[PDB]
Design an enzyme around this catalytic site. Structure first.
Site, PDB file in Angstrom:
ATOM      1  N   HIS A  62      59.181  28.198 -23.956  1.00  0.00           N
ATOM      2  CA  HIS A  62      59.263  27.577 -22.730  1.00  0.00           C
ATOM      3  C   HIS A  62      59.952  26.242 -22.493  1.00  0.00           C
ATOM      4  O   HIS A  62      60.307  26.023 -21.703  1.00  0.00           O
ATOM      5  CB  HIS A  62      57.955  27.656 -22.221  1.00  0.00           C
ATOM      6  CG  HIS A  62      56.937  28.765 -22.369  1.00  0.00           C
ATOM      7  ND1 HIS A  62      56.064  29.060 -23.303  1.00  0.00           N
ATOM      8  CD2 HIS A  62      57.494  30.058 -21.670  1.00  0.00           C
ATOM      9  CE1 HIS A  62      55.668  30.381 -23.374  1.00  0.00           C
ATOM     10  NE2 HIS A  62      56.375  30.995 -22.363  1.00  0.00           N
ATOM     11  N   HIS A  92      57.243  16.843 -23.174  1.00  0.00           N
ATOM     12  CA  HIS A  92      58.104  17.893 -23.111  1.00  0.00           C
ATOM     13  C   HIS A  92      58.777  17.449 -21.960  1.00  0.00           C
ATOM     14  O   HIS A  92      58.738  16.695 -21.147  1.00  0.00           O
ATOM     15  CB  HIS A  92      57.419  19.241 -22.963  1.00  0.00           C
ATOM     16  CG  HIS A  92      56.591  19.463 -21.664  1.00  0.00           C
ATOM     17  ND1 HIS A  92      55.286  19.173 -21.682  1.00  0.00           N
ATOM     18  CD2 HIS A  92      56.933  19.851 -20.600  1.00  0.00           C
ATOM     19  CE1 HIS A  92      54.784  19.260 -20.340  1.00  0.00           C
ATOM     20  NE2 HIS A  92      55.786  19.660 -19.638  1.00  0.00           N
ATOM     21  N   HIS A  94      61.572  19.499 -18.554  1.00  0.00           N
ATOM     22  CA  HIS A  94      61.921  20.405 -17.820  1.00  0.00           C
ATOM     23  C   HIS A  94      63.486  20.200 -17.447  1.00  0.00           C
ATOM     24  O   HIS A  94      63.617  18.929 -17.085  1.00  0.00           O
ATOM     25  CB  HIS A  94      61.101  20.560 -16.702  1.00  0.00           C
ATOM     26  CG  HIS A  94      59.837  20.950 -16.848  1.00  0.00           C
ATOM     27  ND1 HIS A  94      59.187  22.210 -17.098  1.00  0.00           N
ATOM     28  CD2 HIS A  94      58.662  19.821 -17.286  1.00  0.00           C
ATOM     29  CE1 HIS A  94      57.956  21.993 -17.375  1.00  0.00           C
ATOM     30  NE2 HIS A  94      57.411  20.713 -17.291  1.00  0.00           N
ATOM     31  N   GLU A 104      60.985  18.990 -11.751  1.00  0.00           N
ATOM     32  CA  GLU A 104      60.188  19.887 -11.048  1.00  0.00           C
ATOM     33  C   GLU A 104      59.760  19.366  -9.733  1.00  0.00           C
ATOM     34  O   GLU A 104      59.758  19.822  -8.447  1.00  0.00           O
ATOM     35  CB  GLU A 104      58.960  20.023 -11.893  1.00  0.00           C
ATOM     36  CG  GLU A 104      59.306  20.684 -13.180  1.00  0.00           C
ATOM     37  CD  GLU A 104      58.072  21.541 -13.821  1.00  0.00           C
ATOM     38  OE1 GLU A 104      57.102  20.826 -14.325  1.00  0.00           O
ATOM     39  OE2 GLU A 104      58.150  22.685 -13.737  1.00  0.00           O
ATOM     40  N   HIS A 117      57.441  15.003 -18.979  1.00  0.00           N
ATOM     41  CA  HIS A 117      55.954  14.892 -18.927  1.00  0.00           C
ATOM     42  C   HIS A 117      55.115  14.694 -20.158  1.00  0.00           C
ATOM     43  O   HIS A 117      55.524  15.232 -21.107  1.00  0.00           O
ATOM     44  CB  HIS A 117      55.679  16.485 -18.528  1.00  0.00           C
ATOM     45  CG  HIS A 117      55.967  16.898 -17.232  1.00  0.00           C
ATOM     46  ND1 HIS A 117      56.013  18.416 -17.026  1.00  0.00           N
ATOM     47  CD2 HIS A 117      56.326  16.330 -16.039  1.00  0.00           C
ATOM     48  CE1 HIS A 117      56.569  18.307 -15.782  1.00  0.00           C
ATOM     49  NE2 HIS A 117      56.709  17.317 -15.124  1.00  0.00           N
ATOM     50  N   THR A 196      52.162  22.943 -14.340  1.00  0.00           N
ATOM     51  CA  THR A 196      53.021  23.642 -13.522  1.00  0.00           C
ATOM     52  C   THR A 196      53.631  25.066 -14.258  1.00  0.00           C
ATOM     53  O   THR A 196      54.525  25.754 -13.975  1.00  0.00           O
ATOM     54  CB  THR A 196      54.420  22.558 -13.481  1.00  0.00           C
ATOM     55  OG1 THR A 196      55.058  22.416 -14.889  1.00  0.00           O
ATOM     56  CG2 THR A 196      53.932  21.576 -12.932  1.00  0.00           C
TER      57      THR A 196
END
Ligand SMILES: NS(=O)(=O)c1ccc(C(=O)NCc2c(F)c(F)c(F)c(F)c2F)cc1
Ligand SMILES: NS(=O)(=O)c1ccc(C(=O)NCc2c(F)c(F)c(F)c(F)c2F)cc1
Ligand SMILES: [Hg+2]
Ligand SMILES: [Zn+2]
Length: 258
Positions: A62, A92, A94, A104, A117, A196
């Site tokens: 992911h 990590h 996104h 996000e 994050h 999330t």
């Protein structure tokens, strides 16, 4: 099948297996700067990462997580809207397929290239597993990334990515200093939210920094060369691993600055 970010298993499908997706305190949300309330009682954040011990970097299908030793109070977050000590367990990102998307959270509907994050858990609960069952179990420090000048501190992360190209791959990642990823100002917005990604548990106090850090185009390009798939499976580039903004509902976003 398992959740993801594709047409058939993306964010709009999550509610089928994780009903909490349509909950009251889901994240991320759009931060409307003109309705966020300045709260003068909000204390300054206290980020103590001088003793942080990174251990491993992993591609989990992911995103990629950099894991830290959280057996003791080595890297902690205190202050701000938090009561108690929270230990850093992992960080990590996104990101998007294009520079105009990836974050996000959004600020006044503006999307950034990526979002970092830094995940922490409340020590009063003993372990992360117990902390996720509490309304104040986690604290995630969110930092926006905009494309511009290279961030020296991010390069070690960037260089090790070739080693964890596919799902399940991990690499030893010691002696990384997360302090190299912080912007110079620690002004922030805060609101009660959730993870999330599934299971989407509503146990997070979100602390989103106002000042983004800049990363070069070459740095974010390398994030985009990772794969969602495991070795030997059809190649799917790991891009756009972000969830769209959720309704704020009966929540108020507080700001630590005027
Ligand atoms: N101390 S260590 O051996 O290096 C260690 C490193 C990473 C993890 C982990 O990533 N589990 C994920 C995970 C989280 F990172 C959470 F923040 C959370 F709430 C979870 F429930 C969870 F499973 C657990 C222990
Ligand atoms: N992007 S973010 O909101 O900061 C975020 C941070 C951590 C996690 C996480 O630790 N999930 C792992 C995890 C599992 F893989 C489980 F199977 C489980 F049951 C958990 F509770 C759990 F946290 C998910 C999202
Ligand atoms: Hg919870
Ligand atoms: Zn995240």
């Amino acid at each position: 099948h398992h959740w993801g970010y594709g047409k058939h298993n993306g964010p709009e499908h999550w509610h089928k297996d994780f009903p909490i997706a349509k909950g009251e305190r889901q994240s991320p949300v759009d931060i409307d700067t003109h309705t966020a309330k300045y709260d003068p009682s909000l204390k300054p954040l206290s980020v103590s990462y001088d003793q942080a011990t990174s251990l491993r970097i992993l591609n989990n299908g992911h995103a990629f997580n950099v894991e830290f030793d959280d057996s003791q109070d080595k890297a902690v977050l205190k202050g701000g809207p938090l009561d108690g000590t929270y230990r850093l367990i992992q960080f990590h990102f996104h990101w998007g397929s294009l520079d105009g998307q990836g974050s996000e959270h959004t600020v006044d509907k503006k999307k950034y290239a990526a979002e970092l994050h830094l995940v922490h858990w409340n020590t009063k609960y003993g372990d992360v597993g117990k902390a996720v069952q509490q309304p104040d179990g986690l604290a995630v420090l969110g930092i926006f990334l905009k494309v511009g000048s290279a961030k020296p501190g991010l390069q070690k992360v960037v260089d090790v990515l070739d080693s964890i190209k596919t799902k399940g791959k991990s690499a030893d990642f010691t002696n990384f200093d997360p302090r190299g990823l912080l912007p110079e100002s620690l002004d922030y917005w805060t609101y009660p939210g959730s993870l999330t990604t599934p299971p989407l548990l509503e146990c997070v106090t979100w602390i989103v920094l106002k000042e983004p850090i800049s990363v070069s185009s070459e740095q974010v390009l390398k994030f985009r060369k990772l794969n969602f798939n495991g070795e030997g499976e059809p190649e799917e580039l790991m891009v756009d691993n972000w969830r769209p903004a959720q309704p704020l509902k009966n929540r108020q976003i507080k700001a630590s600055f005027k």
